[model samples]
Target: GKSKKWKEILKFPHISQCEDLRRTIDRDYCSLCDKQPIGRLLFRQFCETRPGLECYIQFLDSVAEYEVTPDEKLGEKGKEIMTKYLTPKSPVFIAQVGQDLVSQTEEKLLQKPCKELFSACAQSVHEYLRGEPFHEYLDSMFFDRFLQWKWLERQPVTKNTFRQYRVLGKGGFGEVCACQVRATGKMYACKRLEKKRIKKRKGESMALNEKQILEKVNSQFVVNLAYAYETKDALCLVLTIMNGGDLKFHIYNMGNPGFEEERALFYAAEILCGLEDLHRENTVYRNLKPENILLDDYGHIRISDLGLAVKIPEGDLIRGRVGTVGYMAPEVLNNQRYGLSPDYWGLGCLIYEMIEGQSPFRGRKEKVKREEVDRRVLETEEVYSHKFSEEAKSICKMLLTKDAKQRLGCQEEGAAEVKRHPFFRNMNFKRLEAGMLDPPFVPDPRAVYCNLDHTDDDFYSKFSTGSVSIPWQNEMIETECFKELNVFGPNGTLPPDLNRNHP
Candidate 1:
């Protein structure tokens, strides 16, 4: 019963005892001492509270010389006894150890000169940590020092700059997320591409092609690149936020077989202007579909996703079996060399789909194969199954013509011939490009939500539940070529205020 035995002894310092009582020291420490005065003096000098037996004897001898009774020393004896039995550990020693550690930490912190010491390296410790946690030392000291050092360097990015809100859609390239820039508080759609996936797919050329084209074309009708940066695992492209969403959204989400003739003409005219702009630069926009045509906040269409686009010399034909099945022209599907005419064919199909709510070559309720689509595209004459005006029917037929040579826009006048058609007789191309022409329909604000909806159930579920990480531990970002890719700012030059090492 150590607790019970020590209960009375715990309240040790009874100052009321007032120099009265026994001089006998504890017998437990009295080991019949031999004469060793130096050892006894050393122990007494260190332990002031419990001086050893010889020191106590010397004190008693001094008391006898002073004629003070042993009863007068009772207070000191009780204190030494209380200190021994009441406590067995040193609180002062524990406190001293804690203070020593704190001083060492402060001293270490002062030794780290500055974060700029690592400025020769492009990546900040923060960016480095994103790839691998501050695992160099794998200790709190290293992490704490890193945190302090990171604070000294500039905070180039966080969830704030180009902050991703949610995913818009996924493609062969990667997923697109709705993002916003913190500086302007303006929204944008960010396309993220995993380098590994792109490299594995051998799509590096295609990605570079898209970046080059986007950088070159600054037309208002086309979606241009706003920012370009890379991370350890992925590449990012910031584009103008098309908050009104894509054309495919309205087509299927609203009611199928698409819009009326007026609405179709409204979208078609702007797309023509966009096509003309791309063509002026000898660029063929091979991928033209409802998904690629995005509506801005004003409900105006801007052509996007130029990954499949290619630039060539004037009248030079590109040979590739490219473009979507439903929108592909006979020449494209036939694997023959085609110029900008396939783009015209794609536009024709888009306009027809807007009016008819389904592709002219595709029937309702049947899984049509690529062979069927190509065969039907080459063999068909009239595209309309329902009633329509002569201008609508005539233009649709001319654009859908199987022979690429006789297609509406493939002639010498280029898109000018299609523009002069009776279908666009009242449309002013210049005004359309200038945004002076009024659209037949503006997308509803209610339908302007950003993230992918139920239409992408499988895509959403598959990617959402996966544990796939970003790119990988590749040094592709360190090459001088990558460093000089030169992401153009809004002013057509590198941003003077932007850090090239922001990635």
Candidate 2:
């Protein structure tokens, strides 16, 4: 009965109700009891289907079921656990177990009883679950009372809540600007979309889709959304502020022949990681250009501008003649039914530009027409410069393949296929995913990489009114759960500028 009641409470849709239940459970179990009697049991059940806990729960369940059985049957159960939960191919396979422990267990499991055979593996997993990093995961999943409290305490966010600064960039419907949250003093990029412009351009769905994708994605290689609010005339999306500037600036404005192989490889690997995460969410980042890739203070690249991205379910295709002109793939240019392959084509173009200092399809002349560029993209064969290494040439050729199915990243293995190529053979993808490697370039602290002179007070005035509000906006402002989710980083602060006097 108690189990059923707990299960019922777990299904509560509201975080506040879940917090109340968590508080009751804490009182009943005694907050810091060493045994953690109820906590352990409930957590075990709750984490059975949760990521990183599947192996632990499976081990516990197998041991419990086999405890009272005959000793002769122990070997069979042990083999089952080893094959199903400990093997590398298993989805829930625990990767943290030491080589020595695994080999020792393999030898002993056949001879010993099941009671404590997997104790060492279980111990390792227990430690992982109780580690410092897992605390946030736990709170997010079940016990986030503080999160709920913070949500209730804060006022609704409005345009006035942010101290707007210099313009970062502009788009068809609106402009992005540097801004700081007045209450928290944390920096962010505010992308404001005017209602009139959106309605006129028939871009309402695109604007909303961009917001949804930004909210859904939480990858280090992708820009994060901190808050979304509506005003009387516009919608504002508060996002991670990338102070280092866009990749276009670094490639064109900073130098002549573009980045060296080492630098290009670093950015390529990071972009690949970003694409991998987006594709995992079934999202295709249709726009992949130097302009859409922004550098954070640390110089790491984050894919931005998801306005052209779309979700393509398995075995399905989307038809849209979208994306930047030079970067668009043949399939997309022809309006063919496509999936994620076009993004890889764009990646190839980006890599070519990074190394060759010019787009593969664009003419060398400054005033190349859009029609000429499209014609070159469709019919012209790429002529590689003498500068490209053999490996780089091979990768570019495979990625720029006209056939979508034959593209470098279109295979069943996806990015893994691209990662294994000789061009990226020297890259450590594991370290890259963890953001452990240092970037080749860090932006100057004193300099504003973007244009600092374009301040449109007239344009900004339209979004000043705070009369308009949305249901989700109320939830976001009240809870500030996005900040608590660590989407804005630990303190929600930007890296301190070394030259404090410059601004």
Candidate 3:
């Protein structure tokens, strides 16, 4: 829940007003016992002093559950307690229950095990229930996921583990399809590659390498591999679906030929976050292109397509001239041994494309000649349009340097050094990582397929022969791990139980 919701529900004047309650409710700790209790200690404290509405409400909840009677309230402190707290409910009834509590408190309420103290306070809710259409007004004013009981009361339908929606795009290795988990009702992308095509060829090792790298790393700015399975003929990697499409699609097809400086900076910062994660894990992302950068529903970017990526230890050199031609570093085209420096070169190309609507060294041709592109990359100094910001050009010049030693992120600190550049001077990568900053764009889910080929029942028939595999079919499924994916917040404290004794 948000802090505002916390304040209102707890009836705190401000979030800080609940300073004592926050620590108490934040985690299970017992002040008197000086130990963290196995369960919440909110109720125990409420009996001693009515702390807030949350505690008072729970006290009423227990009172209704325990059902204290009139005869029970006839004792010492009972009348005073009733007059102080429950004066609005009924003076006669409050007097009866109030006296009962005092009498019970002295004699043996705890020893008798009747749970009287647990039902200490009640009926301070009238002030809150002051207006008409009260329930509707309260419901409209707040959102509590717990009140959506339909999730738990599921019909127990047979789990349709994977449901393919449509083929979004075709790739060199596989078909990236829009899919969903019928059980979760959440969307995902399934990159399905034919096993035979990859097995003997280098594609097999590359695909496996990608899966291994993806499985080992988890970061906000990188695509996540949610589940992995193989069919008899196809190897399927279930990934976080980016409904917002790739940068290429958005730039060309959406008529957003070029991004404004601020928009480009936002995306560039996000890409850096992903790069930082890869570098930290000692992995080099060889493939860097606008086509490989995808956006989520929120327009935040994630770096994908890791088939060319490889894990290398610090001070180790990797031998591979792989990646999109226009984005490849000069050293890579020369087939000289390289490390993470080339990725920074690719970042330069990517930023240039975002601002210029073309790769830094690309010609006007639709299909760039790889050999010609290589010559320019090796010999040419990047020329920026005067229209581009000076900071953008400076970053490009530094990152696209042929001298790997002086490359923007090639130093020991890796991506950290790149993030410190003046191009990103106004950015707080810390805030970006925490999701505290608002994004400049959010993709419309309805328009996710706007630029893609329209395929339906007739189209699906063409690829119906594709076979799939489920990895855990024969093995015993573990419920313990599955239990960790629950909807409720820890111990079912969400969708708060908000009723109290009315009768």
Candidate 4:
């Protein structure tokens, strides 16, 4: 609560009366603290709010004056996990602490035992440019989810002792780094938010918002929020790393999923599942795009970059204009109001990208006006029959209709209806979950391409400069949302399931 105005002045104001007030505050705190909800263990109630102890946001820097003991090490367990898994690049076992809050066993979460997450990551580097989707598995068939459910196979990944792998793609938001835990060999891709950045925007709900979402979202398709930590200057949001990079990279490399109608349909179905989970959880993923979708080291993808993720309050208007250009719904760009339906607009753009080589609503044609573009989108038939493939156009038409009130996910079908789209015909979610499909396209060459030594020969990509995206999901936003003018755009394999012979 230290505001800009109160800085140096508050230090001289302390008095003995503060001690007596502490007792009263503690009594009040104890009363309401119990009602603060279970999963939400607010750090404030214990450290920040008690009158005399009126905790500052950062107790680490100030509270050092009070030398308290009986304190446990912050990341002891996390350290132990890293040591076991990183050596020889092997999978290590992680036993569950057996807290009453979470469910599922340890072994089931790690998927492939010791070799799953570890090998998946290594293979991711070998395959995709940004490491295609070979390693990330959150479903029963994929390793990561396997580890999460099979807790007996590995230990919980908490406390920030995670290992780091550099990201492969580039973005205006920031450099996306690939990360993993040494313990169960679990991997995730993290988008590091700069401190100066989050501060500019993010009003006040920065840390709490991040804390709330990561704490609340524990999903199979959505990237898991391992935890949030900070260095002296930067805030690090740890997440599930997808090796395949994002949709742009994949589409760029593959030219197109080109499964004819079948391939496009399958991907559409998969994306719908992701959208389903996102909305059902009462969350709105505003920035949806090819850039936002990442591939597992294999070929499977998970949409990430939740900096723009917001909760859709019931009966409330989502008046905030939060989305990239080209893909943003018409309502958002025009009326400056949007809701979950906007995501469908992004879906249309994404599906079109999968078919054509670019964004459906992106770029400029010499003769067309923005209004004409909007008008075209407003007509269902025009959108359906617009420029793409018959099947591709069909999906895009249904997804991009301008009126959010009439959009897909916002309509009666919800996710299930989107699931039934022809785009997802041959997709067998049951088989997918069972690990039946093998990717047709894989990274041709095998090996980590970065210069770990920072040699001159290494390619200096945009990521090297740290051209980060703004942290709408966090507190400290430094630069303006890098407009680029044009804009765009979990979990699984768990701990506890380890391969004894891993590494």
For every candidate in turn, the CA RMSD to the true structure comes to: 33.2, 14.3, 19.0, 20.9
Error of 2 at 124 (Å): 6.2
Better of 2 and 3 by TM-score: 2
Off by over 4 Å in 3: 1-160, 365-368, 449-503
Local accuracy of candidate 1 as per-residue lDDT tens digits, 46-115: 2332322223333333322222213344345433422332122522211112344434433433453321
- What value does the lDDT take at residue 500 in candidate 2? 24
Q: Which residue pairs collide in model 1, if any?
A: 257-357, 258-357
User: Residue 143 of model 2: what lDDT?
Assistant: 33
| Model 4 lDDT per residue over 58-152, tens place | 22222221122112431332233334432333343222112221122133233322212123332322233111121121111222211211221
Better of 2 and 4 by lDDT: 2
**Decreasing lDDT order of the candidates:** 2, 3, 1, 4
Task: Choose 2 or 3, whichever is better by lDDT.
Answer: 2
**Candidate 3 positional error at 139, Å:** 39
Measured by TM-score, the strongest candidate is: 2
RMSD of model 3 against the true structure? 19.0
Global lDDT of model 2: 0.70
TM-score of 2: 0.66
Q: Who wins the lDDT comparison?
A: 2
**3 versus 4: better lDDT goes to:** 3
Q: TM-score for all predictions? A: 0.56, 0.66, 0.59, 0.52
